[PDB]
Swiss-Prot record:
The lineage of its organism: Eukaryota, Metazoa, Chordata, Craniata, Vertebrata. This is Bifunctional 3'-5' exonuclease/ATP-dependent helicase WRN. It comes from the Eukaryota. It comes from Homo sapiens. Multifunctional enzyme that has magnesium and ATP-dependent 3'-5' DNA-helicase activity on partially duplex substrates. Also has 3'->5' exonuclease activity towards double-stranded (ds)DNA with a 5'-overhang. Has no nuclease activity towards single-stranded (ss)DNA or blunt-ended dsDNA. Helicase activity is most efficient with (d)ATP, but (d)CTP will substitute with reduced efficiency; strand displacement is enhanced by single-strand binding-protein (heterotrimeric replication protein A complex, RPA1, RPA2, RPA3). The record marks 110 as: Interaction with DNA. Changing residue 49 to A: Abolishes exonuclease activity. Restores chromosome stability in depletion experiments.
Length: 196
């Protein structure tokens, strides 16, 4: 048996516009569209994905970068398919003017630096924002925050989450999964920030 708290909740599924980009210049220009829609201090949900196979002692190289900039739009930048890392995206990620929210984001910063020599700037660990605004001291996960704040759980098909993110093109399922994780980061920040 199990408590109500242990019940399976509805899955969180982003239903807004998912912009898929797999070319460097397209990506850079898209990053500028993002910059035109935001103002200093604004926060976007952040996440990234990498293939399952290990490479020379480390995790597969980052293949996808996701940015949810509003409740109705999320970008999927398939960098593994790009000839060069998009300059517009590098500057957006290194821009202190835009805040990037997520869980375990400090670890993303490290991997991003190792993989592309990019310095993620002005990121916020959602775990700390939650403990701060919810007035608690918990060890959160993106899933537990989605559950606590939204009453939903994250899609969990392991064959999708641990799929070959570097395989082009991404499947509709991969796109849904990746976009939704960044969307979660965006919504969680927004809902927490509004708290008095
Ligand atoms: Eu992640
Ligand atoms: Eu993810």
């Amino acid at each position: 048996h199990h408590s109500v708290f242990e019940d399976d909740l509805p899955f969180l599924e982003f239903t807004g516009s998912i912009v898929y980009s797999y070319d460097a210049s397209d990506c850079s220009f898209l990053s500028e569209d993002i910059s035109m829609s935001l103002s200093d201090g604004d926060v976007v949900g952040f996440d990234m994905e990498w293939p399952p196979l290990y490479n020379r002692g480390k995790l597969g190289k980052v293949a996808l970068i996701q940015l949810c900039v509003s409740e109705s739009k999320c970008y999927l930048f398939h960098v593994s398919s790009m000839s060069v890392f998009p300059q517009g995206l590098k500057m957006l990620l290194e821009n202190k003017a835009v805040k990037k929210a997520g869980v375990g984001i400090e670890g993303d910063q490290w991997k991003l630096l190792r993989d592309f020599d990019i310095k993620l700037k002005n990121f916020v660990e959602l775990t700390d924002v939650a403990n701060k605004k919810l007035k608690c001291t918990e060890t959160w996960s993106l899933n537990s925050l989605v559950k606590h704040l939204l009453g939903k759980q994250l899609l969990k098909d392991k064959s999708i989450r641990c799929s070959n993110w570097s395989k082009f093109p991404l499947t509709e399922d991969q796109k849904l999964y990746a976009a939704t994780d960044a969307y979660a980061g965006f919504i969680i920040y927004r809902n927490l920030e509004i708290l008095d």
